[PDB]
Design a protein around this ligand. Structure first.
Ligand SMILES: [Mg+2]
Ligand SMILES: [Mg+2]
Ligand SMILES: [Mg+2]
Ligand SMILES: [Mg+2]
Ligand SMILES: [Mg+2]
Ligand SMILES: [Mg+2]
Ligand SMILES: [Mg+2]
Ligand SMILES: [Mg+2]
Ligand SMILES: [Mg+2]
Ligand SMILES: [Mg+2]
Ligand SMILES: [Mg+2]
Ligand SMILES: [Mg+2]
Ligand SMILES: [Mg+2]
Ligand SMILES: [Mg+2]
Ligand SMILES: [Mg+2]
Ligand SMILES: [Mg+2]
Ligand SMILES: [Mg+2]
Ligand SMILES: [Mg+2]
Lengths: 96, 106, 53, 67, 223
RNA sequence: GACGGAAGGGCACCACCAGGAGUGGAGCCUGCGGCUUAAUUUGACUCAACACGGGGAAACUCACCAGGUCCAGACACAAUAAGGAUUGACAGAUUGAGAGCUCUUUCUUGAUUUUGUGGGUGGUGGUGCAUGGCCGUUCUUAGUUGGUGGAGUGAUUUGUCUGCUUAAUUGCGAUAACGAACGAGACCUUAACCUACUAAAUAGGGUUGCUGGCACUUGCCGGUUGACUCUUCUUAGAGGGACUAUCGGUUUCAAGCCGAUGGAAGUUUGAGGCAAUAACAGGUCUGUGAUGCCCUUAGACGUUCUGGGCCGCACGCGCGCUACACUGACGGAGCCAGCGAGUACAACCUUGGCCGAGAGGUCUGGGUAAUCUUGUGAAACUCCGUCGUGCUGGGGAUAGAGCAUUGUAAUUAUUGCUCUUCAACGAGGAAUUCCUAGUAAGCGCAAGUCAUCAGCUUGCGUUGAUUACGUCCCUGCCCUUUGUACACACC
């Protein structure tokens, strides 16, 4: 729960970029893939997010799955300052 | 202008044998229509993958054992051909379940 | 965040985790499956495994 | 313990009922005929049926049988 | 990329299984049944079957895209290399898994269990299956665990006319008083089955004979 | 219905004949005891527990114990609100300790929190009689319904049976039943046959180049990816093939069974896989982010480190292995499989060559695999010599010593080989296990395990018989008839 806030911010940014986050059920792991943060920290953050709505969670097969709801998206926007017409995965980037 | 013979191996691996056979047949037909020198749908020792297990979740009954086996079918299709023709062939020639793989070069 | 929170767990039944439950109990490492056998004996049909003989 | 099952026997009986001609005593022809006329999802079963039909034919040379 | 062929195949199978499990978990509301993986060079197609296809789709690229992203994250592949399609299943009645899911949903919301089972059976029959069977194990009023078998038509228990003929679905249903378990075995009709044999392996059916008139004078018919 | 210390039928090498091979004996290795312990964690207990929990645990495992460490007390509400909420902090003390664990000092740290109150999550904690799921067991026995009919006021029953066959409720026949279904069968995979098809410098075999070795003449035997063609063997693919076939009698010349002939194959062709109806208060909540409830919860049953322990011994029982000799023993020497499985983002299977008596190492490889380890040149077996029925050269058990190797970690030898010590045991009492053909037994190999370990399991070959080819006498079940004051059903 005691998160060096920069790391948390980075995690949030990553989430916003993606629209989706996949976490290992691996505590004791030194560093998560992609983000230069500890898996555990990420998991904690996502748990926190879930506990106040925002994110839908799955524990399936030693893998946590994280999809962001509309309220969640709004909250993320508020956190990051980015205004409107932005990434996640609510709509396609172009023709893909 | 080109036509430089490379000799190309095609791998055909899968489980559902019928599908594999069909694919092989299709490939041979295609080869015939493009008219090439080719070695046939060479078959390898169809590898069984055995996993034998206590049927009991917990080791309290009679000692029932099950061999869960995976039949695998490995096929080599050798072509005396350039690469362009192979590419043309592999534009289609894909059917669900079966693995199409091009080794390329002799 | 503590400095000493890991044993040298390179091998043994510790490092070897299952793909479903994460068990250290009866782990079919064979073929690079890494499953606790019980679960496999339920999912095997989808894993392409069948019993014939 | 090679007692032919109910099913095979029944099939043979049916065959004899519907196609008493075209059952030329010996096995091989009869087998083929069975394969043609009766639809069997197997091969061994078909063979068995053929055998039973042949037996029936042999019997029916040496008198009338019940059913 | 690239391992031993056998090993690769095993891994693929495992992946498929995992995916199936995820879809059972994630797309629970979506009424999911089956996954149909097609792996080609570059673009890997993943077909997904459900009752409520609209839900799966979302509002044009909603849930499906998220799922794709998740898949990518799981198995290292990039955007475009994995494609996901959601489809209508051709009559859900023959499909056991879908039926099981429906039953579970009926249970969870609040309905008569026996009656629900009967309804399901009726639906299956209407669809056109040769027979079907529902088993409901657990507490169905009172503490002692009770099995409840409900069936229609034939149900082949033995033989290779099972792996080819009977779709089986096992589910756990979670309740406040205790966990129910719903098993459902469905007898698909031989003809509509298409894959494998088109009739039951024991059965023998013979056609009707055709009449021919003998003698009528030998005669000659010339051209 | 169940039951009987009732009556008959009828099965079954989990019954017995006729046999074998044995186990209990002996030494050990390994469960289970019973103790004992800091803790020796536990789950089982007739078949249906006891080399089983894939349980061959050096830590991990891990469930146990003695201790340290940590929060992974989500969110909801308040006191601090930076003049400070806060994490750290080498030196040495402190301290199993390059754990600032905490106290000293005095720099940081940046409202994430600190700590309470509502609340939750975690648990190899409990409950398997709250369960699901799976499994086991009745039983892989031959059972089990239902439709229409009959007998019944009914519950029910007949059908499903006096008999004769079958591996079989398998069938024939008798017959208020008739035709049905599930189960048995059929099916399915494999093991067998194809000198007919499909093809193969990844399986093979031929003819000639180059030459290697000869007899010395033409001819042998080779090696060599040279070239060429074939496909017997190898491989699979497609089919076919056996249907008890052909007669011989037997039995109402039914169902079928036995004998000869042919045939690759006449025990359901062998082996399974699947497996009904209902269950058992059978097994697991120690496979689970399968789980109802109860428990606990931050000086924790959550976690994680450090060490031990599950391997203790006065002794019970059950798996096994090795021995008790000349069917030997040890050297030589000959020399033969089949399943297997095996790495690139790593620490695989590892050839081949020098150094080491072994154990092994090293430089180069080849193999993400019919291609390389690999003809896995395995053992058992087959020849000659040496010793010839001595607790002996049978047997290698209690043990000391080095070198290695695995892994941070080997003492409580992990294991390995070498020299040694060289014991119990001269064919195993009462009981009883397993078996009817490539079956029994022997003999290895491989995989599962796995950093390391095999005496264990799965598998696969390799040698390869005795005696039945029956019957209910014993044991267990099964159905009928009988009786019953039992139906939570004789505990
Ligand atoms: Mg059947
Ligand atoms: Mg069967
Ligand atoms: Mg028994
Ligand atoms: Mg050990
Ligand atoms: Mg748990
Ligand atoms: Mg129980
Ligand atoms: Mg009536
Ligand atoms: Mg009756
Ligand atoms: Mg006779
Ligand atoms: Mg059989
Ligand atoms: Mg009990
Ligand atoms: Mg629990
Ligand atoms: Mg133990
Ligand atoms: Mg045992
Ligand atoms: Mg080989
Ligand atoms: Mg001596
Ligand atoms: Mg073992
Ligand atoms: Mg009386």
């Amino acid at each position: 729960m005691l998160i060096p806030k920069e790391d948390r911010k980075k995690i949030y940014q990553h989430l916003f970029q993606e629209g989706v986050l996949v976490a290992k059920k691996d505590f004791n792991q030194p560093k998560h893939e992609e983000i230069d943060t500890k898996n555990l920290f990420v998991i904690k953050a996502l748990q926190s997010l879930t506990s106040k709505g925002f994110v839908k969670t799955q524990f399936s097969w030693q893998y946590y799955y994280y999809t962001l709801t509309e309220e969640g998206v709004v909250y993320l926007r508020e956190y990051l300052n980015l205004p409107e017409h932005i990434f996640p995965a609510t709509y396609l980037a172009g023709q893909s | 202008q080109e036509v430089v013979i490379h000799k190309i191996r095609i791998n055909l691996t899968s489980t559902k044998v019928k599908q594999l056979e069909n694919v092989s047949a299709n490939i041979i037909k295609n080869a015939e229509t493009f008219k090439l020198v080719k070695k046939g749908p060479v078959r390898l020792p169809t590898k069984v993958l055995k996993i034998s297990t206590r049927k009991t979740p917990n080791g309290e009954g009679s000692k029932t054992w099950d061999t869960y086996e995976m039949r695998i079918h490995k096929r080599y299709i050798d072509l005396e051909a350039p690469a362009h023709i192979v590419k043309r062939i592999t534009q289609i020639t894909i059917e669900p379940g079966v693995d199409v793989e091009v080794i390329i070069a002799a | 965040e503590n400095v000493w929170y890991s044993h040298p767990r390179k091998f043994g039944k510790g490092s070897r985790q299952c793909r479903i439950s994460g068990s250290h109990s009866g782990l079919i490492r064979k073929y690079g499956l890494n499953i606790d056998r019980q679960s496999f004996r339920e999912k095997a049909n989808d894993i392409g495994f069948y019993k014939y003989r | 313990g090679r007692v032919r099952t109910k099913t095979v026997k029944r099939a043979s009986k049916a065959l004899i009922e519907k196609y008493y001609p075209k059952l030329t005593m010996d096995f091989q022809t009869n087998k083929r005929l069975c394969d043609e006329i009766a639809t069997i999802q197997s091969k061994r079963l078909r063979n068995k049926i053929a055998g039973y039909t042949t037996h029936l034919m042999k019997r029916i040379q040496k008198g009338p049988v019940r059913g | 990329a690239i391992i031993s062929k056998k090993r690769k195949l095993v891994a693929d199978g495992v992946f498929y299984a995992e995916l199936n499990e995820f879809f059972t978990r994630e797309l629970a509301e979506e009424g999911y049944s089956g996954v149909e993986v097609r792996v080609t060079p570059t673009k890997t197609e993943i077909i997904i079957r459900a009752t409520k296809v609209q839900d799966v789709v979302g509002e044009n690229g909603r849930r499906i895209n998220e799922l794709t992203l998740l898949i990518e994250k799981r198995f290292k592949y990039k955007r475009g290399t994995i494609a996901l399609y959601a489809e209508r299943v051709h009559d859900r009645g023959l499909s056991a898994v879908a039926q099981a899911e429906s039953m579970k949903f009926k249970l969870l919301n609040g309905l008569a269990i026996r009656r629900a089972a009967y309804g399901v059976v009726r639906y299956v029959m209407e669809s056109g299956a040769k027979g079907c069977e529902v088993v409901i194990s657990g507490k169905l009023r009172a503490a002692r665990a009770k099995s409840m078998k409900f069936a229609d038509g034939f149900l082949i228990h033995s033989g290779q006319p099972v792996n080819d003929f009977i779709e089986t679905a096992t589910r756990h249903v979670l309740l406040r008083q205790g966990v129910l378990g719903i098993k459902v075995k469905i007898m698909k009709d031989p003809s509509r089955n298409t894959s494998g044999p088109k009739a039951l392996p024991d059965a023998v059916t013979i056609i009707e004979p055709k009449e021919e008139e003998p003698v009528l004078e030998p005669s000659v018919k010339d051209y």
